[PDB]
């Protein structure tokens, strides 16, 4: 079933017992934290075997 990603993450936040509004009220910060964390995986994997 198609679902918008900012709605999927509110279901996933609600799944860990954090109220849905905590995603939307922080969505830009949360997106930046995720994008930056994925970037650090590339640096880690490229830097060390």
């Amino acid at each position: 079933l198609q679902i918008p990603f900012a709605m999927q993450m509110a279901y996933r936040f609600n799944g860990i017992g954090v109220t849905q509004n905590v995603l939307y009220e922080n969505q830009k910060l949360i997106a930046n934290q995720f994008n930056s964390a994925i970037g650090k995986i590339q640096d880690s994997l490229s830097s060390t075997a």
Partner: protein, 56 residues
């Protein structure tokens, strides 16, 4: 609990796993803050069941 949907003209709240449209009210919803932060928010009436009760 559940999710907002529209049939193109009307807005309903409904369960995640089985389509059953419900009229949106202050009892099936909760509030946090002003509109301006929330990406993709839209406008509708949210009904209040108390108003006919006080109107009596």
């Amino acid at each position: 609990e559940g999710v907002f949907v529209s049939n193109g003209t009307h807005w309903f709240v409904t369960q995640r796993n089985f389509y059953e449209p419900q009229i949106i009210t202050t009892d099936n919803t909760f509030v946090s803050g002003n509109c301006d932060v929330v990406i993709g928010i839209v406008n509708n009436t949210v009904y209040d069941p108390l108003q006919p009760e006080l109107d009596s």
